Design a binder for this molecule. Structure first.
Ligand SMILES: [Mg+2]
Length: 638
């Protein structure tokens, strides 16, 4: 091949590393060819270095992955880039295509294809393309005053190429992925000693480049730091490897303290972005942990990640799905089981992560049921952790950012296997034009389970928790949001007898207009009575509910088409119901809503509800509800 003995590799290595004794001896004598041979011997016999990305005892290849691998064999890269590979090949002006090419997305497919098929064509070809990329993509620099005077050509093109081949985004991707390529191809005779020295010199150059080019902020900085830990954990024989690990750890530790509330919730208030953050922080912890470097992480980092996991476990439903608040789609059970299995290896003394990883075969659930997160603004009522549970998750928190929607007070509710109050969801993640109109539709306050004034989006999103009482046969949340100028919305949620919910909405202030109490119904056949202000699902036996709203004289009800989305660019029709009251003076507007889950619709009880205090009380509430004629008082003092 075109690989050559890069004897400068030996100066990059800690030649006192255990197992490198013959490398060190040969290098000291100037026998660098024999030293390179001994170095390959060392890596082939190594031993205490693995990655979570691959199990060399369980290598598989997918159908598209075999397809990318076979294309790679013919220089088609996941276009045909020629026999003499044109790494700058531009058929049309496409910067995105040029950057994507330098991710080498087909190298690892060829590795897997090499191991599963067992024939050297994949390893031969990859060695060639690996070296050829090194040769045709040098990392160079030029003065800007000279760059402007140079004309187009090989020297100018090489300098401009650096913007594409060595952008930190792609460089850090290769830092991680090449640990997979290394493990897959190392047994091959094409993986010669000279090639090894080329691989390590190139790899080291990538790590040094990232250290010099860390992003200022964002998820990109997290991935750079995580992959610097990859570099230093997978090649701890580099002199600089402990420094690379420490660099990445310090960054991740600092950023998790900026991003995560003390109760464990990530500050975007978005379950999907919360889970993505867990996984960045755990992938870093995992590569270190499996290679003996767990102790390099500060204890506060371990504790914070464990709190993020417990936060996610709490706001999830017993079927492992998450509420679709903010921009969150549903992450399904198969993916979450894989997540809990990985997390349980990282926190093996956490008995709840173990329970969730094993679906209850081992481990233990927490010694609590309902649970509140007072900094993040998420509140969970539950009568069980299992598939028979009744569970509500209420979102009523501080201001968020891009993903968070104006939905303070909204909730999802899940009963005995089915989500009966799903969020309208995200639907459109990003776009322009008509799709942007649909993204904003789903962000409206009026397409959530909360209160609006004239159906307007909340002007302020900054909930205050007045009371949180998670224990007993009456559990209570009281939250208040100054939703509009001269308008305060106090929502009281009672979870009664571990069975049903009573939601009291009280709007105070001098603001006038139409007060709208919105509920977004589940999909399917739902019976309603305008006379009684009742809604009763007509679903298959197992998970049903009855909702009834009790309001002042003259309350009206309106049903409009609405939408629910659990996956991006997919949505289904369901009813958007509002209970509307004309607020034409300074008196408060007050509602009581009963929500009662039942397995069979025919068993849904009759309700009544009344305020005992006929005037709004800034410092308390007392109501009386009836269930099949049986009285229950619900009250609190603030
Ligand atoms: Mg929403």
């Amino acid at each position: 091949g075109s690989q050559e003995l890069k004897s400068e590799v030996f100066s990059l290595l800690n030649l006192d590393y255990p197992g490198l004794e013959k490398v060190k001896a040969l290098h000291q004598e100037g026998k660098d060819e024999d030293a390179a041979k001994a170095l390959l011997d060392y890596y082939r016999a190594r031993t205490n270095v693995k990655t979570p990305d691959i199990n060399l005892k369980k290598i598989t290849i997918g159908k598209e992955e075999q397809q990318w691998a076979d294309d790679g064999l013919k220089h088609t890269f996941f276009y045909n880039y020629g026999e003499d590979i044109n790494w700058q090949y531009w058929p049309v002006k496409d910067n995105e295509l040029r950057w994507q090419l330098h991710r080498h997305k087909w190298f690892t497919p060829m590795g897997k294809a090499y191991r599963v098929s067992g024939d050297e064509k994949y390893a031969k070809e990859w060695a060639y393309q690996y070296i050829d990329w090194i040769k045709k993509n040098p990392l160079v620099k030029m003065d800007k005053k000279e760059y402007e005077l140079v004309s187009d050509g090989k020297i100018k093109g090489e300098v401009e190429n650096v913007r594409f081949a060595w952008r930190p985004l792609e460089v850090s991707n290769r830092l991680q992925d090449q640990t997979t390529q290394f493990q897959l191809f190392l047994p091959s005779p094409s993986f010669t000693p000279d090639f090894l020295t080329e691989f390590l010199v190139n790899y080291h150059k990538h790590a040094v480049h990232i250290l010099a080019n860390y992003s200022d902020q964002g998820n990109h900085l997290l991935f750079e730091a995580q992959r610097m830990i990859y570099a230093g954990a997978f090649f701890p024989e580099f002199k600089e490897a402990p420094a690379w690990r420490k660099s990445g750890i310090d960054i991740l530790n600092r950023e998790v303290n900026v991003q995560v509330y003390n109760d464990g919730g990530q500050f975007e208030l978005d379950p999907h972005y919360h889970l993505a953050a867990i996984n960045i922080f755990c992938k870093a912890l995992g590569i270190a942990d499996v290679n003996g470097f767990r102790n390099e992480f500060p204890q506060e980092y371990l504790d914070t990640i464990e709190k993020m996991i417990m936060f996610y476990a709490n706001i999830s439903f017993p079927d492992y799905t998450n509420p679709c608040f903010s921009d969150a789609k549903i992450t399904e059970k198969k993916e979450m089981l894989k997540n809990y299995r990985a997390w349980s290896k990282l926190f093996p003394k956490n008995e709840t992560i173990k329970y969730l990883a094993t679906d209850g075969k081992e481990g233990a659930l927490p010694d609590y049921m309902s649970k509140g997160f007072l900094k993040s603004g998420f509140f969970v009522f539950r009568n069980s952790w299992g598939m028979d549970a009744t569970q509500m998750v209420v979102k009523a928190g501080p201001k968020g950012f891009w993903h968070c929607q104006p939905d303070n007070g909204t909730f999802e509710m899940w009963f005995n296997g089915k989500n009966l109050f799903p969020d309208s969801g995200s639907y459109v993640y990003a776009g322009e034009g008509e799709v942007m109109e649909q993204r904003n539709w789903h962000r409206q306050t009026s397409v959530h389970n909360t209160v609006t004034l004239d159906n307007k989006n909340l002007e302020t999103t900054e909930s205050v928790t007045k009371l949180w009482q998670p224990e007993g046969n009456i559990q209570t949340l009281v939250t208040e949001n100054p939703s509009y100028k001269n308008f305060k919305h106090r929502r009281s949620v009672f979870f009664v007898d571990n069975t049903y919910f009573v939601i009291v909405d009280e709007v105070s202030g001098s603001a006038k207009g139409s007060v709208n109490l919105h509920y977004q119904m589940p999909k399917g056949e739902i019976a309603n009575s305008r006379e009684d202000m009742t809604f009763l699902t007509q679903f298959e036996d197992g998970s049903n509910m009855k909702l009834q709203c009790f309001g002042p004289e003259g309350m009206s009800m309106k049903k409009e088409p609405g939408w629910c989305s659990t996956a991006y660019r997919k949505r289904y029709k369901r009813m958007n119901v509002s209970f509307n009251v004309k607020k034409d003076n300074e008196n408060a507007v007050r509602y009581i809503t009963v929500i009662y889950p039942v397995k069979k619709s025919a068993d849904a009880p009759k309700f009544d509800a009344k305020f005992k205090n006929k005037t709004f009380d800034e410092n308390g509430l007392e109501i009386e509800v009836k269930v099949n004629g049986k009285k229950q008082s619900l009250k609190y003092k603030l």
